[PDB]
Amino acid sequence: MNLNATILGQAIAFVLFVLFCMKYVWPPLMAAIEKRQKEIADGLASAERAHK
Amino acid sequence: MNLNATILGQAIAFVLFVLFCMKYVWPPLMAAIEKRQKEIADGLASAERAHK
Amino acid sequence: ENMTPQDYIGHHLNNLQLDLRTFSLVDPQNPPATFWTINIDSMFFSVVLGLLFLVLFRSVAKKATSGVPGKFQTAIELVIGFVNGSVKDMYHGKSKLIAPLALTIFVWVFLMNLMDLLPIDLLPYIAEHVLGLPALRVVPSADVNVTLSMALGVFILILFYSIKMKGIGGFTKELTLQPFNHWAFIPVNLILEGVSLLSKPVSLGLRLFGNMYAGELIFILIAGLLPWWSQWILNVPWAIFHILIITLQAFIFMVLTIVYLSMASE
Amino acid sequence: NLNMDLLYMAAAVMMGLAAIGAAIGIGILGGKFLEGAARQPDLIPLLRTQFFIVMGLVDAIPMIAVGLGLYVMFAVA
Amino acid sequence: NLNMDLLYMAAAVMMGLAAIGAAIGIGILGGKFLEGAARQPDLIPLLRTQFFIVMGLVDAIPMIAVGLGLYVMFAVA
Amino acid sequence: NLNMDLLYMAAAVMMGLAAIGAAIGIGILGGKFLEGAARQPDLIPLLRTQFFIVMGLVDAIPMIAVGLGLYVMFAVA
Amino acid sequence: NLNMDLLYMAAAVMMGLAAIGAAIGIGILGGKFLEGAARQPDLIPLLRTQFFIVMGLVDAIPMIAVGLGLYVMFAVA
Amino acid sequence: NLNMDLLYMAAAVMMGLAAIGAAIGIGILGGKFLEGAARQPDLIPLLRTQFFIVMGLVDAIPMIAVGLGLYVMFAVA
Amino acid sequence: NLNMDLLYMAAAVMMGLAAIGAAIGIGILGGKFLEGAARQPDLIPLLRTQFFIVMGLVDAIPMIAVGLGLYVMFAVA
Amino acid sequence: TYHLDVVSAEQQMFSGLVEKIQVTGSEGELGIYPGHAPLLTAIKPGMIRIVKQHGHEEFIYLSGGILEVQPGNVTVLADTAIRGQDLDEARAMEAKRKAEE
């Protein structure tokens, strides 16, 4: 067997994994953080209505 | 596999990460969260008092 | 380089055990025989990931503000609320220990499993060639010694809480009397309740090792056997699956620790 | 030499049979927990207690069987 | 060599089959406890007291099999 | 004298198959009692009487295999 | 022969029976999740977290035999 | 030498048993999806997401056994 | 000579257990289709679609087993 | 054969002896035949269809109801509408304002 070939196949398999992670795993996270900074803002706006 | 002196070494690292996390990380974070949650309740009370 | 694949798969499964007596970086051709040969790789990577846990959370805990939080600070308070909401679900006592214990177990056991995702030859190559170390394997939780060290750590907590919160009088009743009640059954009950207590932590640590060892070994086999052009079609579907296992085995070690420490006292 | 080498086959039998017994036994018991949890969901922390009561009885016999299998491999063999 | 070998094998079949019996037989019985728990939850302390009687009979016969398994390994050797 | 070694194995398979049949039989039979107790709990000492009348028949053949396998292990071996 | 080939046969028995036990036990448990999730489709986050409590206990005991089966092939043989 | 024939038998036991557990556990699990997809046919996009979450757990231990059976036959034997 | 002969016994256990896995697992999954079609006959072209989605997962493992049983019998033989 | 009633709180809709019915059950379509074991269901909006003695064919549309079966008897307790709209709570809203104004 060729050892540097194993590192080549691992690179191709990592690149294809990253490209899945970016399109199916990361956006659910940046969705969640963004939608918990939406909630906070609404509550702070509600406090201004309490202030009025 | 093989049982080893690593079992004691990891037990020192485990206790000391729990002690510095217990003092330093957790109380200052949860004071800061509860200090926000408390104010939201204060705003709601103010809205009730205003109406009355 | 005379790597046969049966030997390539061999050398990858060898940790950096080193004897206190000789203080010598052993290699896979001949393993010495003594207890005192710390697995260098596991301690160093375990504390470096454990430091990275504490350095990140302190760099936020020392500043975190009750305004609109920043986009980094919000990712830390999401894990804080996830950990506290899971504690608050399954534990009612006053103890200041359970909540941070549950945090460190989640975030550290998560970081340990995450190492298994990296390409299996990346760090082991650099350590042999650049440094010159005889071996490396870089997943800490894919070795028993760390997982039994955590699971016996939680067992000493299980005994401390059952003594403290209900006393030797109460602990001696529950170990003898249940589950058959009559004093005629006490001799049998001492076997059943004693081993069941130990069965809880032994399942904790060997669940975590059993998953992680048999996931690292799959990347070693796929790397060792298949030719480079073909590895990605069996590697990529497995890394996509093991992202699920690294989370669930960190979440379950958290959850069962809470459940065992919580059901110990109440 | 065949004396110890068969003992690994003795522990394989003993703790393999325990693995089918305990996993199916908790799988049945846990299924009646989740269906109980969907009929009365305000009730889960009651029933889960009960699940942890009886799961402590289910595993006790398989876990000595696994423990005695581990003993044959590491101690005896 | 192979007298002492086969005794450990004889204990593996004895404790392996007993671990299937004790685990599966409480899986069925304890799932029927849980469904009577879910249907009438205020009644749990009564059924639990019936579950511990019945469950004592189920294991009673597997636990003389386990007791002879530990005898064959430790005592006969 | 090799004869002793198989008789422990022949007692092992009677007491293992007895422990499976006598534990899963009382698990199925006792689990229908507990749903009968969850439905009609003023009936329980009526149903215990029928449970003990029926449970004596589940244990007719297994207490003989435990009976003769425990013979083979001690009297004959 | 008899050293190496039996150790693969021991690992085959350990990690084959764990394949039976952990698959069927989670098939049984996972069907009650999907029945509860068809009855109460607002509950699925609550039931899946209960499912993750229960599935942890089912898989733990087979995962003893999975890790030790890999030990017998790679570390022993 | 003869030894290499037991290595195919060891893979045969390990790989066939993992085909018992991976096929029946998905059948049990999958039929419970169809039964709930018959009921609430507007929820086929949601239940079919849960099925892939729980189905991922069922076949996991069967996937290790099938992977080690291929290693034994081709790589070792 | 046994290096020919055992390979047919080694393939018989692979294509026996692959046949018990694929036939029971499709029978359980196919029977739940047949009730839902009897209850909801408007939905058959729907349920038949999801039956064929779910059926291809049940067969993923048993066709590894039968393809290696054909390979072991004829190629290595 | 068995004796079918169709009734509502307002009226008897039908009564007579019947050889079989098809009726639209809560979980699926249903047929009832002589001596069928006792049975209880709600019924969906739609047709119930009947064959009287001598197999004479009769269809009735129902907004809904409850079907039950007993030895020798079938009775359908039909009702005027789904009622599940509950928009008639609004009809109570002006009952308040007209009292206050």
Residue numbers in the entry:
A (entry chain Y), B (entry chain X): 1 to 52
C (entry chain a): 4 to 269
D (entry chain I), E (entry chain Q), F (entry chain L), G (entry chain P), H (entry chain O), I (entry chain N): 3 to 79
J (entry chain H): 3 to 103
What did the authors write?
Here we present cryo-EM data showing E. coli F1Fo ATP synthase in different rotational and inhibited sub-states, observed following incubation with 10 mM MgATP. Masked 3D classification focusing on the central rotor highlighted sub-states in which the εCTD adopted either a condensed down conformation or an extended half-up conformation. In this study we observed the εCTD in two conformations, a half-up and a down sub-state. In the half up sub-states, no density for εCTH2 was observed, however εCTH1 remained attached to subunit γ. The sub-states of State 2 showed the best detail for the two εCTD conformations and allowed the c subunits to be assigned to Fo rotational sub-states based on their interaction with the εNTD, assuming that the c-ring remains bound during rotation, which is likely because the interface between the ring and central rotor has a buried surface of ~1200 Å230. When the State 2 εCTD half-up and down structures were compared additional clear differences beyond the εCTD up and down conformation were observed. When aligned on the stator a subunit, the Fo ring rotates the equivalent of two c subunits in a clockwise direction when viewed from the membrane (akin to the synthesis direction). This rotation of the Fo motor was facilitated mainly by a twisting of the central stalk (~50°), but also by flexing of the peripheral stalk (~15°), with the remainder facilitated by small rearrangements within the complex. The twisting of the central stalk involves the εNTD rotating about the γ subunit and this is mediated by a ~10° bending at the foot of the N-terminal γ subunit helix (defined by residues γ39-57). When the εCTD is half-up, εCTH1 provides an additional link between the εNTD and subunit γ, stabilizing the conformation of the central stalk together.
A key component in the generation of cellular energy is the F1Fo ATP synthase, a biological rotary motor that converts proton motive force (pmf) to adenosine tri-phosphate (ATP) in both oxidative phosphorylation and photophosphorylation. The enzyme is based on two rotary motors, termed F1 and Fo, that are coupled together by two stalks: a central rotor stalk and a peripheral stator stalk. The central stalk is comprised of subunits ε and γ and rotates during the enzyme’s catalytic cycle. E. coli and other related bacteria exploit an internal subunit, termed ε, that can sense the environment and inhibit the enzyme under certain conditions.
